[PDB]
Amino acid sequence: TDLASIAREKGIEFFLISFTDLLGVQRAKLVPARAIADMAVNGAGFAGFAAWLDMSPADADILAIPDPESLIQLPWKPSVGWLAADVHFEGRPFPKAPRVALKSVLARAAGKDMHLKHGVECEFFLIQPDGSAISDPADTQAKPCYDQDALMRRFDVIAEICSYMVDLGWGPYQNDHEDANGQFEMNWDYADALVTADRHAFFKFMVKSVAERHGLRATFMPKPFAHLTGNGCHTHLSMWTAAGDNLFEGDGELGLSPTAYAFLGGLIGHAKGLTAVVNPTVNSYKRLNAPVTVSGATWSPNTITYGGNNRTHMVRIPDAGRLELRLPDGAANPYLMPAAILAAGLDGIETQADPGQRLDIDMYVEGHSVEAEQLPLNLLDAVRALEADEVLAGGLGAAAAAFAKFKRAEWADYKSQLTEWERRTTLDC
């Protein structure tokens, strides 16, 4: 695809050549249209150590090579065109780069005529620019989910973003106020994993950018308020053949196939290590296994279990032909997340993993009634599980060890921070 020509036809003056680092941070260069042809072929250069890629100041430049198919004219500023990119190093795609890691797992699966398609539910809060409070002081009621008043009070921001998604062809189909005061969700059609991953990366950038233009702020933080529901990023998952058949579609329980259930078996089996990737922050572990919120439920997973159309489990079966992994949160990396999930699912399919028995109970109420394995309770334990999980660690390649190193560093930093609770309850010991 000819980016220079497109720039002229469409009035694009600058391109953002953008990649996602291990921690999910969007890294980009802003290049004027006159330079795009060279950049598209040779890539934009960066000092990799300066992003979260676990390199050395002494290493040669990485080159981020833009995917011309990913082009998006910023709908709020159409003179700029955003491009997702694969980081290359020493002439080959760099295995520590999330988008590259994802593509590698996708290629393996594709070689067996299995194609991951997913949709993401990127819940977010709208907050004051200073982070002190949610953006809407009138959004206070104990059960605010789907609140019409508070939704319409932020119509201008929500509708603007939704209209952008319409224009971009993402097939958006609904927006609402979510279960925490100040929290929202906007949904759009699932797609090939790579397409969704790119869209997912762009979406966060778009929401943050538009929120700012309205003097607001958006956060995807997993648990920004102790007593309110957190930000999930559920992924709905299905596996397709090249000919266009959904392999999860079946005659078994709840309209699922044995392939779907073996995939689920992979999810269940690798859940501990998978948690490290899709719940990648210290804060993630305050969303999981959270005490009950003011709205009456956390809506997040506590245990390594699955139910039917039941939102109290790690996995929900929402309808025939797909799985809903409810585990990931708003911090989850848009590339590592599908990559990690796929690696786990493929292994489930290859080993014909047994997901175990479906639990048709409210796990928040009756978790005690049954013997169920708890999810990792903190980042450090989840990371240890990642490192000990060969399938996962090997599926993600060098990204896994790099990720683990960073998360351990974050943990060492966090575990030394004095908290107000400690002062209040220990000063008089």
Ligand X SMILES: C[S@](=N)(=O)CC[C@H](N)C(=O)O
Ligand Y SMILES: Nc1ncnc2c1ncn2[C@@H]1O[C@H](COP(=O)(O)OP(=O)(O)NP(=O)(O)O)[C@@H](O)[C@H]1O
Taking residues 358 to 397 in sequence order and writing x for each that binds ligand Y by CB under 6 A, - otherwise, the string is ----------------------------------------
Contacting residue, 98, 119, 232, 321, with ligand X by CB under 6 A = 232
CA diameter of the chain: 72
Q: Can residue 176 be called a binding residue for ligand Y (CB under 6 A)?
A: no
Query: Binds 190, which of ligand Y, ligand X, a second copy, none (CB < 5 to 8 A, cut-off by type)?
Result: ligand Y
**For residue 394, which phi and psi values (nearest 5 degrees)?**
-80, -35
281 is a contact residue toward ligand Y (CB under 6 A): no
Pairing state between β 80-89 and 14-20: parallel
- Rounded to the nearest angstrom, the gap between the alpha carbon of residue 158 and the centroid of all alpha carbons in its chain is 20
Q: How many Cβ atoms from other residues are within 10 Å of residue 212's Cβ?
A: 12
Whether 185 has a binding-site annotation, put simply, is yes
Site for Mg ion in 276-305 (CB under 5 A): none
CB within 8 Å of 174: residues ≥ 6 apart: 186, 187
Residues 6+ apart with CB under 8 A from 254: 308, 317, 320
From residue 6 to residue 45, the character string flagging contacts with Mg ion as x (rule: CB under 5 A) and all else as - is ----------------------------------------
Q: How far is CA 51 from CA 86, 96, 154, 260, 393, in A?
A: 14, 11, 34, 37, 21
Please give the residues from 242 up to 281 whose contact with ligand X meets the rule CB under 6 A.
Answer: none
Q: Which of 66, 81, 172, 395 touches a second copy by CB under 8 A?
A: 172
Residue 222 in the binding site for a second copy (CB under 8 A) = yes
Does residue 324 interact with ligand Y by CB under 6 A? Answer: yes
- Buried (b) or exposed (e) across 237-269, using 16+ Cβ within 10 A? bbbbeeeeebbbbbeeebebbebbbbbbbbbbb
| 133 touches a second copy by CB under 8 A | no
330 is in an annotated binding site: no
Report d(CA 156, CA 70) in Å as an integer: 27
Residue 168 interacts with, from a second copy, Mg ion, ligand X, none (CB under 5-8 Å by kind): none
| Residue 219 contact partner, candidates ligand X, a second copy, ligand Y, none, CB within 5 to 8 A by sort of partner | a second copy
Instruction: Give me 367's structure tokens.
Output: 């978790």
Candidate segments 52-60, 242-250, 266-274, 345-353, binder of a second copy by CB under 8 A: 52-60
Q: Name which of residues 89 to 118 contact a second copy (CB under 8 A).
A: none
Cβ neighbors of 300 (< 8 A, separation 6 or more) are 229, 230, 232, 287, 288, 290, 326, 329
Q: Which residues bind ligand Y (CB under 6 A)?
A: 45, 47, 61, 117-119, 121, 187, 189-190, 234, 236-238, 318, 321-322, 324
